[PDB]
Design a protein around this ligand. Sequence first.
Ligand SMILES: N[C@@H](CCC(=O)O)C(=O)O
Ligand SMILES: [Hg+2]
Ligand code: NA
Ligand code: NA
Ligand code: NA
Length: 410
Amino acid sequence: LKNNWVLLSTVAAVVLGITTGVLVREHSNLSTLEKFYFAFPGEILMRMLKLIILPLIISSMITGVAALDSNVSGKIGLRAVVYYFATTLIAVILGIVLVVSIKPGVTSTVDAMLDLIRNMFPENLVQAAFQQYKTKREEYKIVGMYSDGINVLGLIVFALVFGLVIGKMGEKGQILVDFFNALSDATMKIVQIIMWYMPLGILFLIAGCIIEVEDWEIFRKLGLYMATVLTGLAIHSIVILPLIYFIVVRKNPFRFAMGMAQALLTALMISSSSATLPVTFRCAEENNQVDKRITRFVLPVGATINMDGTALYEAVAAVFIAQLNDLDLGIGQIITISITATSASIGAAGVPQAGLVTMVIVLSAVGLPAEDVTLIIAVDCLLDRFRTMVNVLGDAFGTGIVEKLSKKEL
Ligand SMILES: N[C@@H](CCC(=O)O)C(=O)O
Ligand SMILES: [Hg+2]
Ligand code: NA
Ligand code: NA
Ligand code: NA
């Protein structure tokens, strides 16, 4: 179909990469260095996508907050925050219920929960643009250290405050608001340029992902672990979120979901929600006909907070080892895993290796060794390419609901 060139090219690249991964792996053998060199275009595409995160997040968030009126912004943010909280709680509850029902497992926390508050208020803005803050205790004195990795939470709250102040100032801040308004358009144009090269990177990324698997034995060893996660994802994406859309807005959500499936394909191939955010803009804001200010406000905050699938994974995979590691279920034990998983879901970054570093917190919450990550770690990657879809749907669904709630004020 004409005018669907991007979607058709992405589908063709995906199927070609799947064919390459299923063919070249069994008809040849490559060393680890050759496997690394095979996925070089995918690495270049990832790097190009990560390059655009810094100027897009701040510009879009500042524009979204300063575009609205002085009083409407606080109320809209309140609805968005409460929506995110309810969705995360529902996701954790559903994941816990499923992992407990299927029971597939038959066969330093106070210094990490405080790091979120220490990261929301960075000491230096330029350092927070490319570095994070991590604290450790040693003999027992608290020692601070700065590690590499872009800080998104502190930047996001800084954009919140800056946009609110600029909107309050009014005429004096007009130059500063037009600057970021132009920056947002320039960044969107750059993302549109990257769209041209993205299919080839997607093809090579999929091929490299299929190649790196070892013997397919881990598929059978931890098959139930994949099954519970996929069932939870399907339930959360088909039964709960469409239900809330239909209850709030008397429209069918399936056309809304299917129209923007290109963002789903891109995110699922690149296994990242923060990096796919510009694609989420390009799809939702110009296909589902949602307000620009709403998408420039709800999506940036929900890109790092609305991580439903992450929280579901924390819950299911923590109760998995709670069953496996010579332990039994506990009533208050379920509650502490739910709370810790919610906090880690709020506390996790938008990178494909996330969900493991924040996993240690919820593993130690129930008093278990930190070395149990090596259990599901083998399939932990192959599966993390499936936790972003529900995040993208959650943000897109939230945009329409918050638009409907505040239609009069818009
Ligand atoms: N890949 C996830 C981040 C959390 C995780 O990897 O577990 C996302 O983009 O939403
Ligand atoms: Hg992978
Ligand atoms: Na959520
Ligand atoms: Na998200
Ligand atoms: Na998070």
